[PDB]
A and B are shown apart, each in its own frame.
Chain A
C-alpha cells in the first residue's frame, strides 16, 4: 500500500518535468524506466483499482497534489487528472515527450521503436501502447469529421453535446473536491471566474444545473455559490436565452424570487417617449423592452408553480406604480396587457 505512494509520487514528478524542456540528460534507460513504471500503474488500475481503501488513499494523494499545486503560481500543470488517468498514464507521457523538441535523437528512435515495434508482436494478449495510440488518432480524426460534417449547436444548450460534456467534466471535478472537503467549491469557482472565458463558463454552469444525477449535490452546490455571489448572477440572467432561465427556475425554485427581483430592477430604469410608441432605456446597456418582454413571456410560459408566483409579482409592482389600466404610464400594466 505505502510501496505504491513512493512509486507514484516520484512518477508524478517525472511526468510533470516530462513536458518541461530540460530534456538533455534523458536516455533509453529513462524511457524504459518510465514505461515500465506506467505498465505497473496500468496493472494496479486493473487488479486492485476497484473496491479498495488503497483506491481512496491514492485519490487523497492525487487530489491533495492537485490542491497543494493549486492551478496557481509556479505553474498550472495538468498532471494525470484522476483515478481513471492511472490506466493510460503511459500515453499521456508518450504524447508529451514527442511535443518536447529538446528530446535527444537516440532516445526518440529507441522510444518510437518501443512504442511501435511493427506487426512483429501482432499477437499481443494485453492491448499494448501501439493499439491505444492508433485508437486515439482514430476517435480523434473521427471527432474532426463529425464536428465539420453534421455537428450543429442545438439552440436548447441542454441538448448540445460540447456544453453537455464540459458540464460533466465540472461535475466530476467538484464530486472529488466534495469528498476531499479540504477547500470548499466556492474558492475553486471564484478562481475559475477570474481565469476562464465567462460567456462559455456560464452556459456550462447553466446546463450543469439540469443534468440528472450521476453518483444532485452538484446542482445543489452551484445554487449556493450563485445566490452567495450576486454580481456573477446578474451577468447570468443577462447572457443566456429565456427558455434556459425558465428551466433553471422550475427545477431550482431558489432562483425564482431573485431573478424576478432583477427584472423588477431593470424595468424601473426605462422611460417612455410618446413619439416612438416604445419603452426604451436611458443607458445603452439597459436591457431593452424587446429582451424584457421575452423573458417574462417565457417565465409565464412555464409550469403552474412559477406562473402564479411571477403573475402576482407583476400585479404587486403595478399597484406600487399606480393602478392605471392604460398604456404609457406603468411599465408593468404594459407587460400584463402585452401577455394577451
Chain B
C-alpha cells in the first residue's frame, strides 16, 4: 500500500501488525498440536527485529502526514526494544535534530558508542536493507 501511496489503509496494516506483536506472543507451543516453524518463526531476535520494523514503517507514515509527536513515540519504542538495528537510532536522531537537538542527541550518541545478524529470516533481512537509508553512518558521525 505505501508504494501505491495510501496513508490510511497502510497505517491500518502497521498498527494491525503491531497489535499481533504485543497482544500476542508467538512463543506458544503449550500443546505439541502440529508441525511448526522451529527456527525462523520463534527467535526472540526475529520478534525484536520485526517489531522494530513495523514501528519504523509507521514512524515514516506519521512524518508523511506530519505528526512528529506520534512518529517520535513509535521510533522511541523500537529503540527501547531492539537497540542493535541502529536504523532505529538514525530515524529518532533525524526527528531530534529537527526539533530538540542538543541534550537528547548527545545522550543517545554516548549510548550508541557505549553499545559497540544471528539467524534473521530472509524476508525480514531484505526488507530492513530495503527501507534502510544510505547516509545512516554519515548522520551518526555529525
Contacts and interface: CB of A to CB of B under 8 A. Distances in A.
B12 interface: yes
Given A274-B18, A274-B77, A324 B23 contact: no
Nearest to B21: A274
A182 B16 CA distance: 65
Interface in A282-340: 322-329
Contacts of B22: 274-275, 277
B19 A328 contact: yes
Contacts of A323: 8
Contacts of A322: 8
A327 B19 CA distance: 9
B73 A271 contact: yes
A326 B15 contact: yes
A274 B8 CA distance: 19
- Classify chain B: how many residues form its interface, as a range: 10 to 19
- Say what secondary structure dominates the interface of chain A: loop
Nearest to B13: A326
A328 B73 contact: no
B95 to A, nearest CB: 17
A326 B16 CA distance: 7
A324 B15 contact: yes
B88 to A, nearest CB: 15
Contacts of A329: 11, 15
A117 to B, nearest CB: 82
Contacts of A275: 22
Given A274-B19, A327-B15, A328-B19, 12 more contacts: A274-B18, A274-B77, A275-B22, A277-B19, A277-B23, A323-B8, A324-B8, A324-B11, A324-B12, A326-B12, A326-B19, A327-B19
19 contacts: A274-B18, A274-B19, A274-B22, A274-B77, A275-B22, A277-B19, A277-B22, A277-B23, A322-B8, A323-B8, A324-B8, A324-B11, A324-B12, A324-B15, A326-B12, A328-B15, A328-B19, A329-B11, A329-B15
